[model samples]
Each structure stands twice: as structure tokens, then as C-alpha cells.
Target: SMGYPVIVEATRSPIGKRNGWLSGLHATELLGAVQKAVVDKAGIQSGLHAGDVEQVIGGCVTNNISRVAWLTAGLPEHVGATTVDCQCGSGQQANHLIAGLIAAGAIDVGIACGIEAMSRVDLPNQFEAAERIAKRRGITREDVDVFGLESQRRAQRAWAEGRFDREISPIQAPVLDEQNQPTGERRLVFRDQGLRETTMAGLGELKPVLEGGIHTAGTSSQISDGAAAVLWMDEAVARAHGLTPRARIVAQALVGAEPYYHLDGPVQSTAKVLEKAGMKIGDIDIVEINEAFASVVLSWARVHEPDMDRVNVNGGAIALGHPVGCTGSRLITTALHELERTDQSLALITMCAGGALSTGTIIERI
Candidate 1:
């Protein structure tokens, strides 16, 4: 049988504007702080940290977050650390890896964490070997734009039909001055950056980013910086330590889709997880589907028939922001909070990453 009642202690570093507040901090430093914050919140003391933590698995789109976080956080030196990269799914993949180890009796406790300093490493500026492949496949900039436009149109249609709003965590963004200095103020960054006030006339007047396409800056996820982590332990260990399981991981899955038409990856991944859990789309209490682009989610909703009110109730990555590597853990963390706030029992989190990859997981509140 699958493990039940797995305690999860999750935390996140404060998100900062791209190349703004958090840009000066080292990626490892930010990740370590969030790691310690979650572990301490879970009441795991230093003395009890040794053998109690069977392993440390961290997800980062970049390199070395696992070893860096472990050392920087001063976790038990004996615990092994493994870093993973599965594009945007790195953290959830790390979580799944740890859960599999525990369920198979290979380990008892593990931590899954992810971090991204997008401010220092802008998404557009990141290396892209895939562009050659896109060119070879005759996929032009117009194709990308059209894809984005379709996504935005679908998301708007879903909003009109009322299918999304259950999995949102409105993020507050700090204000900055012309010199990129914080003004000691903040604003709610609740809406996706890709959205804008548009009318049919306005949309019709716009050209595609590539050629004869539909996508605009208003329909794609914005690049940002953030970090997130989760502490996981076996049920027995959790009970012995007087810790409460926030949610038990029921099933996890990953899948791939057509490389150029990458938006459908999350839907396939989520479907696999739901099927493995013996649950239907409607059985879930909340769904945290990534808003990689408005088109991606619009496709998911059209295909899945997920309850709109429970999809992303507050908002989504579209509105709150998407920090590549950190998004997986961010979704999981938000799911936990939503479960507690809404008194819901089950939640599903899914994301589509660069290339053709996708990752998904299901959690049940204990």
C-alpha cells in the first residue's frame, strides 16, 4: 500500500523583482535559509538531525543546490545530498524521489527543495540549445506567438466559463525605484504579467512574436526569482517526533509531449497521477496547474474538465509569477497552505517545463 500521513514542513524565500532585491544573494544562501526555516518550523533540532534525515534531495534548474543547501544549512554532515534537474519539475521530482525511497523502505526521512535566482540569470538570457531544434523543425517565432495567443484566448474563455480559481496564491511584490532600489513598499502581484486590458480591436491589431501569430507579452509567464523547500518523513518517524503530517503523497508522475507544442505536457502528467491514485478529475479538492502560458492551461481545462472554481481559485503562475526552478516546490507549498485554509483533503500539483517534460503529484491532508 502507498504510505499515508506523511508530514510536510515547507517554506519559501521572499520573492524579489528580477535583478532587484534578491539578485545580490547567492542561490545557495537563499536556498539554505529557506531549508533551515522549514526544518526548524517542523521542530527538528540539530541533535535529532543526524540519522533522522536519511537523505537530502534538492531540485534546481541550475547546478549544485543539494550539496550547497545541505552544507550551508548545517544539516547533519552524514546525510547524503543529491541534486536533481528536471527543468521546472525539479523540486516535485525531488519530492517524488524521496517519497519513492521512503515507500520502498530505502529511507525514512528526506527533504525536497528547489531554488532559482532568475534575477541574476534571466530566462531570455539563459542558454538555449533548443533554438536550433526549433529552426530545424521549421518552428518560427510566429509559431511561438500563436501558441501563446491561443493559450491566452483559452484562459480568458475558461475565465468566462468559470473553470479556474482554486489553486492561486497571490504574491506580494515589493516596489522599486528607478535605480532598482526597494522603496520600502509592496504591491499585490496577484494578476499574471501576461495579461492586459484588451479588446477585440486591440487584439486584432497586434502581430505575432514570430510570423502571422497571436502570442504577445501579455500571455506568457514572466521570469522571476524565488526558492522553496519541504521536509518529508516516514509516518512512524513523524509520530515518534511528535510531528503532524500535513499531507500524504499519494501518487506522482511525469510525461512528455511534442517538443514544439509543449503545452500539453502537464495534462498528460496529471492524468497519469490521477489514474495511478484511482481518482477522477472531479475527485480532487484543489488543482495547482502551472500557468506556463495561458494556452497551456487553456488546453488542460478544455481536455480535463477540471472544476474551474477549484483550479486556481486565487490566481496562478500567470498572475503571481513563475521562477522556473522554484515553481514546483512553490506549487507544493501553496497546495499545503490551501489545504489548511480551505480544510480540503486532497490537492493536485502539476507543471510543464522546457523541452517536452512535465511533472505532477497528489497530496492528501492528514
Candidate 2:
């Protein structure tokens, strides 16, 4: 039993390809836009009179000053802010902490979000780190290539099925001229920019970017930019604000695993969260095991044996892009929407961070 924190609203910016549509925007601007978008949607008539929002906590990797970005969004200074950096799990961990604080009776309402501008700041290399895991897990290059292809196919299918239509906070990203000058025009970005019509043959032909590596750019997550946020509050706060919660945060856990199998953290976190919730993994109706890497997901599936169809049904970072910090909350945002779309009852969200930490969360439809 936890604080029983519930989500009143959830939204994310359309994923942008690395140096794509969002490239012209600064990291703080991207974060501010997403932060403002959530506040706009969660308020009464989506106005300035937001509820007693006590804090705005989020995860970010590239940006060194998220506090300044928060102020840039015009958020109230009286509210507290705690920026986190747990690697890829940063966003999920931020969300985990927010819910935990609410359950612990520390605050009434807050925002848990993930922000990243991968287009502006590059991702660090994982080659040397991954080689150790690949060997230990007996994961072959072919195995990962297949996994990557499937991820691309799954994402393409989801888009065709309109699985990502809702929960998208369209960005009025500016269109820049040849010299990066504002063109006095803007494009409405409403969908993920990572989907590509690709073939297995195309994947097979790709050479690994890292030496002694099985993963290639085709099978690996795309470098992208995006941000996601969720509005959480206790039941008493929700009722007072005239907000109907969509789901309750039942349980959350952040666990550590050996660095050799860095991406396998999800395996341990899944077990820990399930044990804490007193619920079985089989009871989870939906799962968001992020595709941090092709082998990472493949290795986890062999141990857990979840139905592939129920996991990342609309694809994942592999095809939808992985803006490091943003992916944790992105996974939850996608899982929440998928649950409602499929009329499911339970959702399980998990991801492996940079230093072998897995963050997990369970949500029940209300």
C-alpha cells in the first residue's frame, strides 16, 4: 500500500528526430513548453487557476539547470522543484518520487515529468558497456537485428492504427531559414518523427556503429527530442479541484542491478515492484519495457516471458526515438493511453537507466 497518488492529466510533445523539427528550440524552451502544456490542460477550463500544485519535479540528462528552465515556464516560485539525473531512469524515478511523496503525505499536488533535447545535446556512447552484457547474456548480433526490425514494424503498424493520436501536445515549433533565422512561420508537430518504413533486409545490411557490437543505428533507439508530464494529486486534492483521476499509482520501485548487465535492471525492478504491490506480473495488462537496446529487451523477455503483443504495442524507443531523459515518462504516457484505448485495467511501466537501475511503476485504471 502506497500514498494512493492518482493522475489527473498526462501529455507529451510529439517526438522529434534528432536535430529535426525541434532542433531550433533550446533545451529550456522545450522543457518550458511541455511544463506549460500540462498546466494548461490540468487547470479549471485549462486556465491560470491551477490547483495547489506544491512542486514540479522532473528528470533531465543534458540540461544542467532545470530549475532555471522551470522558472522559464512561468511556474510559481513558492512551489519546490527537485531535478533528478538517474540516467535513462531519471524520468521514471522522478515520477516514482513524486508519487511516493504524495503517499507519504508530504505534498498535495505536483507534476512528474521528463525533459530532453537530444537534438541539441548528444547521447553518450554505450558500446564498451554493452559488449559485456551481450557476451554474458549470449545475445548475438542477429538476435538484436531481428529485435530492431520488429520494433520498427510494430511502430509503423501503431501509427497506421492511430495508436498515438491522443495524449499528444502539438508543438508549434518554428521553421527556421537557411541561416537558422526565424521564418515567421511554424509547423504543427503532432506525431512522433521516429517512424520509418524500413525492411528487415535494410536492417540486416546495416553495419554496427560500435566495433564488436551487435546493435546498429537501425536496431538501436533513435536520438530524438521530446518531453512528457503527468499531473498527480491525492484524492482529497482532486475532489477539491474538480478533477476526475484517470488512474491511480498503485506502486513504484527503483532497483539496482549489476553494471555488466546494465539494461537488465528492468528484470529486477519488475520483480521488486510486483512483490511490493502484492500483485503478480501476469496480472499486468500492459507493459512498457523500454527498448533501450534490442538485446536489452530480448534478454528481459527470455527471463520474464511477457506476451510480446502486450508490450510496447505501438513500438518504443527503437522506432519512436529515445530522448534519454524523456523516455521514462514517455513510456508511462504511452502505456496509459494504450490502456484506455484497449480498455485494459492494469499497466506496468519499467526502464533501465544508464548505471544499471530499473524504475518500475504500476497503474490501475479508474
The true-versus-predicted C-alpha distance at residue 25 of model 2, in Å, is: 1.2
lDDT of each: 0.64, 0.78
Q: What is the lDDT of residue 67 in candidate 1?
A: 80
TM-score, model 1 to reference: 0.70
Q: 165-274 in candidate 1: lDDT tens per residue?
A: 32233344556677767788866533333333444454446554434333444445666667777778788778778777678888888887665555467778888999
Q: Name the best candidate (by TM-score).
A: 2
Residue range 196-299, candidate 2, lDDT tens digits: 87887888888887776787887678667888888888877777778787888778788877755666788888888888999986899989888867776877
lDDT (Cα) of model 2 = 0.78
TM accuracy, model 2: 0.87
